[PDB]
């Protein structure tokens, strides 16, 4: 029952601009290059509009082939700032974000409706996290995985929706499972 992983996207091993598409273009999701604890650059996406009303900030990947996989796995590493560490008494601060996908045969889609995106889940910090010493503090780099299928189009677009969190997406790894090959 051991399956190999076929990696479709590994954002953390992209060097230079990820070039994902943010809606709005400014004042929502921003690409931010940071150094990890080993001084290795990571392209992150961040937003923290917690002094505003509830948000609707979208970020999407370009098209990802599914290579005729029935099911795809999406692993997100992320860090967030706790709402109880931020000002305001409007009750709008969240510690979650929303994950979506849009299956398409078209590898050059633009200006897509919100209602073409299918919600995968609300993503929250849970038990799975790496502890990273950031000076005197222990940062939780949270790891969450979800899967989708049965897939039926040539590929898909992933999207991330911020509704009012202080959130940084650090890694997006997308893969499917494949039986090991026979070594002729």
């Amino acid at each position: 029952s051991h399956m190999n992983e076929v990696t479709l996207l590994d954002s953390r091993s992209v060097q230079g601009e990820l070039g994902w598409i943010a809606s709005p273009l400014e004042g929502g999701w921003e690409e931010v290059s940071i150094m990890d604890e080993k001084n290795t650059p990571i392209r992150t996406y961040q937003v923290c509009n917690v002094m505003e009303p509830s948000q609707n900030n979208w970020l999407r990947t370009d098209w990802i082939t599914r290579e005729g996989a029935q099911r795809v796995y999406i692993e997100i590493k992320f860090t967030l700032r706790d709402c109880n560490s931020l000002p305001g008494v409007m009750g709008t601060c969240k510690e979650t974000f929303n994950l979506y996908y849009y299956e398409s045969d078209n590898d050059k889609e633009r200006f897509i409706r919100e209602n073409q995106f299918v919600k995968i889940d609300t993503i929250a910090a849970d038990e799975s996290f790496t502890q990273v010493d950031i000076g005197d503090r222990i940062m939780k780099l949270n790891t969450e995985i979800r899967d989708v299928g049965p897939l039926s189009k040539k590929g898909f677009y992933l999207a991330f929706q911020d509704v009012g969190a202080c959130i940084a997406l650090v890694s997006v790894r997308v893969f499917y499972k494949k039986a090991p090959l026979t070594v002729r």
Partner: peptide
């Protein structure tokens, strides 16, 4: 906001 996250500086690495």
């Amino acid at each position: 906001w996250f500086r690495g």
